[PDB]
Amino acid sequence: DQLTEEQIAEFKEAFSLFDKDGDGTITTKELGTVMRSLGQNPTEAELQDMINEVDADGNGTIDFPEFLTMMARK
């Protein structure tokens, strides 16, 4: 079950969907854009709560290693 390049690319592609400006972090705005693509209508505060759940380093936004937590949710 060793990590594959296929999986790594899947993780990077998924991160990039959210991180649309390529700056390496997912903001509330970026997360909101993906939520709205899914027909959802979260508020800024709700988006911040979503980020808070995985924002290990407390900088208020999602980086790539934090995003992996999301990929692991069942």
Ligand SMILES: [Ca+2]
């Ligand atoms: Ca970004």
Ligand SMILES: [Ca+2]
């Ligand atoms: Ca963070």
